[model samples]
Target: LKNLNEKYEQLSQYLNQVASLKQSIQNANNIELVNSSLNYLKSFTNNNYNSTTQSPIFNAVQAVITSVLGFWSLYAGNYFTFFVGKKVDSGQPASVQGNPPFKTIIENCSGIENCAMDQTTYDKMKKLAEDLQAAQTNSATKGNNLCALSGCAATSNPPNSTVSNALNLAQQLMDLIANTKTAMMWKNIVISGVSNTSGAITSTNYPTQYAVFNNIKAMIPILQQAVTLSQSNHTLSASLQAQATGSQTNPKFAKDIYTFAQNQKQVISYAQDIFNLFNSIPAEQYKYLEKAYLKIPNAGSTPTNPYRQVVNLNQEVQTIKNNVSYYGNRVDAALSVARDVYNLKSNQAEIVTAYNDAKTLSEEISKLPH
Candidate 1:
């Protein structure tokens, strides 16, 4: 019986490790998605478009237009019109397109396969999934070993409704991730412009472009809900694990669980804040390019500077100037947000202290004479 108890403790410890690993994987995924999406937005601001070619300038403008529309298609779909062609039919206004709202982006990604994640993030996710499966298998083996040693079905074979709920939330997050990936793909695709046209004529990518803005808006709430669900799982798991090990009846056990639960709420809240900030970075970056694109004057078409001729915004004749400082600052902001997401693990000092205290208390309670 003493040896059996020891085995039970070991299994519990192993499961804790699995939970920690999942946390790390989640943080990494968050950072990678935010940074990757930001990188996609950064491409438009490169200003490498050829001044000599009408197509290059037009394409650059088109990229900015699509990004604006793509990012906001959900909230302002009716208010935005994508640029389809550079040729101006004399006195004919550009076609009227409806504004897109953020909700549209969410629906768009949900409709795609694998949620349209780019090849890189998609590959990374598949690896993460594999790692998760390995963890699950290891823990399952350890759990069954403990059950066999104790000959107690209650410890390992009782209805795992709490764990089941956790798994259900886990699957939901995976689905949400697919949607986010698809949205990112749409963002990249729209900014990239249609494959067939060289910014000269019709854009066949509007319906495709509509998905991203909706996805970005969708990403925020989905992640926040995931965070909330995770905390609930943590609370229930801690309670059940303590109960299974006969530690829940201890005078110190309830407070330990409470402390752990409170600390976890903080952890989830911090993660929620980080995700919200991460989601905003790409849109903010897109605004920088929008500012640049909207500033192009109908004048200043010299041999060296072609920006003036590419855009026909009837602004007062001024030199086409890209605000290097304004855009440069946004890049720094994005880098900082990425760093914050990376450092989230270390930011949980309170949670770690509370968790360690709870763990020590649990171990002590389990060893008390039954």
Candidate 2:
């Protein structure tokens, strides 16, 4: 329920943002019509998981998936509890808490009739869950259980299985909506989105063309690390786990880790592009309009009114915002699944450093008013 509420909050915020940006567009923001006219497509697919529930197998899968996602949010976000186990190395998070065989697998998949996933991902996770119970020798391995292994709090239920893990995943999703919102807003308006028609950086009137160039130039060092850390981390972790476990080197394992690593990389990639796109904005219209600008080829000759532009910006901005929200959400889902299920960290911090480094430039640039 707690996790569900979190999802609801994100849904609400996302809708709110969509409305705002929609208001900002004129004739569908040329970025998309404005060129995908991507702005109008900003709407997301946030399922509300009503109470009526689904069937049997579907419900069971949903419950487990939902709970698993919840924990993914937790371990990856606040608590920082990375999953560990034979399966974790393979990219399948297992029961990180409770003792008694040091694992426990309770059955109860619910609220996922509408959710869709790849067959491989579903099978892989099923095996991971079953392995959770199998890995346990008996119910005797239950001590120090509240240690955060699997959301075990010592005070609460100490999460002996998958439910807590799912909650954690859910939380992670909620948190990301904020970051996604920010990144998109900057991209569609301040950086690109061409004209009042859409969020694309047309040809003549982008706001921060020069300023962003300066910002990107400054982040050469930070961006370097951001660009490559996932590959580094994934490569090393995969090798260590494969060598450590020895037998379970199934292709699924490799596939899973690869997916996780790729997802992380994707997020970073988006972050990187978001930065570069922002940088594409020229700093001063007076300084670079002649040499470079994204407004229509002839803004004075052919342009949308500021009011219309503002509307277009809003529509286009919302579109980008929607894309960011969904893309970031996708990243969060994959991270929850791929995260080391023991308790370590999300490389997100490294990604954030790069994001913030560039974002700081945006703030500073914003202050200039020139």
Candidate 3:
């Protein structure tokens, strides 16, 4: 009986080890995605619209690039700071500290196919999914959701490996927690309570972990709010417009207006929150870019030589700017339909109010960076 119990312990520890390894693999892929994007941008910067164009205007553009683009490496440098390590390498290649990729770690985790899915873990995972539905509605609690989502489910200590020591460290930390620790760890990190874990991880190396875990933290809110607006506005507009078309006198969706209108304030509030978040993204995405660009003395906080902070974040900024524009356009479409539907119902005050609000949103969007 003791022998059988010992084997059970071994198997549990091994499972925890493999799960940590899976996280390491996913993190590798996340960093690789960032690396590949940087390379892609470099390729475009080297191109001249397929090299079939020429102009003095383009010549000045070249001058502007040299003055700006070269120093933008500082921006890329800052990103690597968060992505891996920012400390001076002392001339060592990055891989010296890098974890092996996910596939590599998993393939070597244990006996064949053991790393894929765990029937034992399925019940826990299903509960996690249900927890996520609540987290979506309560953004304040959402951060805690990720702790369990990314955390190991080890009932025993997992072995460490060549892949990463952090794997074992993370598990050791997990073991210290009671069941209550799940929520605590998620909100903080490998720790407990309202205090910031970001402090323990020295600011210089603050972003050393790959962002597969962190990106979701930021993206989930954006996506959740977008879905909120989309779900509310899309179906409501479709139903109202179709039923209230010219063919109808009193209108088909008339009865439903009251029902939908009950949620109108909620929907519009969500849209407004989404829009505000969207507006901040261009700056947020390029924060490091701007930071690096300003490192040049002349492009001062109050630019003396007046080197414009352009090329440093040019690509990333424009990219998010484009995203914000596209989403803003969709939101407009959603609101426009609501205005038309209210008009169809001859709800004079509501129609006029909705029209005015929609027009104001449109004008605000127009004023954004084109």
Candidate 4:
């Protein structure tokens, strides 16, 4: 039994070596090391143990080690063999045979050939989908805010207004969208590897991974709707700019119209960023799946740029200008009507009353302007 225990220790050492090798292989990212690990694993199974004069105990130990080595070699070889010659050429499938063991593990767990997640995981995934929907809504609100600001600047009667308001609103909208996007991404990461062994979902200490996923999923549609609204406002701004330019020969009006067009462009860029964020999910999730399966290294946090502060601030100022221009025009039109109605030609009291009535509009416009 003492000898048997010693043999078991040796067997454990061998297995540990193989596991270490497997890890190195996964991390190699080079074809040669992958092939070398495969060969080394195969050699272990092929090598024979000579136990002809050994006690029954030693014989059993040999058999056990042989069996274990054989099974491990077969499994590992099968896992990696198909990927040996596969390369992702332009005409090839987007995914290759070398995809990590995630699909196989999912199949084994769920008894479904193409399953990537089990019922519990699926529930979590659905939650993520919902969270994405929510994130989208948040994004749309941000986009609209930006568009409103941009639209204002595009149509504003100048000398009293600048692009500061539109720029500021755009910055604020972008910041909101960025924060929401990051939250959604982190939510996906947290849930990607959650399992029953980690703890029950309802446990007091359970991770909120599922919650994050659901929140982001729910935000997706909302973002889409916001993008649509933003686009509509952008279109209106363009039309208004055209009208202003065609009707007025003043270069200042042309400059204001051009500035508005530029602001609209910035808003459109933000919308596109939101769209890209949504589109990145499939690839990001796939990467997480690989890491969960021990086929890839876990990702680390990437820090945000400090320069974003300056950029965002500039954008917010522009958004504020945009909002003031568009909304301020409406307020002016209303005041003109009030002047005609009261029959108080240029009276100070009438002017003061008009200003008071337009106070809300002014305040909203002022919020984003630097």
Candidate 5:
């Protein structure tokens, strides 16, 4: 919901800027038209009159000049100061420096007939308009997808329910994390000595790692609710437990809980794989790479090569270091929920038992290889 709100805010701001640009373009074009007329009038009246005989008539021509100057002053007004002036790169063409209300361009021309408005500002405005349209379309599609995920009957807006909002937000967060991970990995291989061609790096399962975290976070509340709901309603619990233990295409319980249960083993296993990846790296090397990656800003419009891949890996490492506890807590929470759902007490559930031996799951993460 917050993401969607930001999208709308950006869309509105872009629209306002485009509207302002359009008005400025029209006014500048008007100034060009009047200037052309003044040039023509000067040429037609040039040899026809002597200054002594037609002083008043020349004053009338001066009136036209004054009117054109008024237009120029208004076009070149402080309204343009709102836009930051660009410092032209040496690589760019001189025409690209054309800034609007373009008073300088209007005054100095090699030939009066050759005075023309530069399209550089208009071209930039055109590009921005295109970008704005793309953003609007992307935002609308995302809003629709969120609305669909929420399963709300109304299609236009986000679901007002807290659970629905949480689910959508969690999904979006997962996507954001994944993209950042990919980007960071792209940077790491270039900056750090990490090998991009290694099987460990090549086969890294970023989707599963981040997806499990998002699913697990949302799953906690649902599983707990199912457990509570199971106590009073035997049929629902029985159905949910059946859904948890067995694999099927159709789900009898809430689909989220059913999917989590079916994928629980893979989820837990991949999580271990994630930790194992961290532990395999030497602590000193890891800290050194971490420090090195931190020195650079998030990778920007750099070329997409192995550099981009390393960046994703670099960021992935940082995320693991910071959130290992949170990840471990999810696993622990999942085990506790599994125990309750399956009625395991004296005999620990397999999920619980697996995590029990994995000492580096939580607080021990800090003590693991850097």
Candidate 6:
């Protein structure tokens, strides 16, 4: 886009030169030269997007063309007067010569020739030119103001602070999942040991469950290490916030930071909700256990089939899985919305940045130590 604007500006400069020299020659060929320059100017006029080149060039070219036509009309009248002797006043009274009759010009020649008129016409054209120039100037000033208000350099990088904070939050959520997985494994083992027959179960089922428990337990320390790394990420985010705030004079920077902060808040809130769900799991699982236990037959002559308890646990697990999946989707949706708002406010080049970030974060969460 910038390159296109530069090209348009270059073309405009050439046109301006042509307009300045238009009076040096009077033949149809000279007029053709002017027309060629005017054509270049017209080519840029209908561009859909506003260009730094278009506004100034459009105004200047229009001014030059109007002035050129005004002078040409005066000259054409003189030419006709010389040729026919009696001032060739065929169409209208001579009093109206300064403002050529539209009907005669339209009937005798092309619209381009008719565009040239005298003093009265020139004054109107001058006023239009001034108005266009003023409008162009005002538009340029407004665009500059908007750029200043946006605070981000017109470039495409997400603010470092936003990226850092997002990474830190990701790490924190990852650690939380790892810890919860460890806790769940321990609880699983304790449940498996509840009705162990003889101590034979200790050497048998207990060892297997304990091995699984220990394996999951080991992930907790790894998660803790990850959490430690996130502290540095948090610090980086803080520094970015400080720098953005300090540059208050640059409104664009401030706006970018403000938007990032809002996105961060949204991400964190969603993470907190997910974390709370993890925290609630123990109680939820306990209720399931109690329900399953109540279904068990009282100890008497006939022992209850353990198959029934197994079936009950399976049903409970399925319900819990469904709940987890639903909440996980909600977290994904929140993150996606946050990312969009961030990209829009930050002026990042690609909307896909937010989409990819959300996907990556969701994948990382899924792969937590659990």
lDDT of 2 at 365: 44
Best by lDDT: 1
Which consecutive 10 residues in model 4 have the weakest lDDT in total?
74-83
Comparing candidate 2 with candidate 3, which one achieves the higher TM-score?
3
lDDT of 2 by residue, 80-131 (tens): 1112233330234433221112121111112221111223433344344333
- TM accuracy, model 2: 0.22
lDDT of 6 by residue, 1-370 (tens): 5555554455555445444333222221233332333233223222201232322221222222222222122122112211111223244333432233333333344322122223443344334433422322233432211111112244432222121222233333333322321111111112223423232111212211332223222323332332232333233234332222223324553344334334333333333332333334434333333333222221123223221222233333343344335434543443333233233424333323434544555555456552
Best by TM-score: 3
TM-score of model 3 relative to the true fold?
A: 0.26
Report the Cα RMSD per candidate. Answer: 25.4, 31.8, 28.8, 34.6, 34.1, 44.3
Model 3 residue runs over 4 Å out of place are: 1-219, 228-337, 343-370
Each candidate's clash count: 24, 90, 2, 57, 20, 4
Superior by lDDT: candidate 1 or candidate 3: 1
Deviation from native of the Cα of residue 26 in model 3, angstroms: 58
Give the Cα lDDT of each candidate: 0.34, 0.30, 0.30, 0.29, 0.30, 0.30
lDDT of 3 by residue, 1-370 (tens): 5555554455455455445444433332343432333233222222211121221112222222222222222212111111111212121123311112223222233322221222223234323423322221223432211111112334322221111122222222222211211111111111121113332321211121223122312332433343343344335434543321233234444344433443433433443443343344433233322333333221113223222333433443343344345434543443334334434434444344544554555555456552
lDDT of 4 by residue, 88-189 (tens): 211121232222233322223232222121233323333432332232123333321221212234342222211233222223333332233111112112
Candidate 5: C-alpha RMSD after superposition: 34.1
Candidate 3: Cα lDDT at 335: 34
Candidate 3 lDDT trough over 10 residues, lowest sum: 181-190
Write the number of the candidate with greater TM-score, choosing between 3 and 5. 3
Residue range 61-107, candidate 5, lDDT tens digits: 22221211121121111111111233231112233321322332223
What TM-score, over all chains together, does every model reach? 0.22, 0.22, 0.26, 0.21, 0.21, 0.20
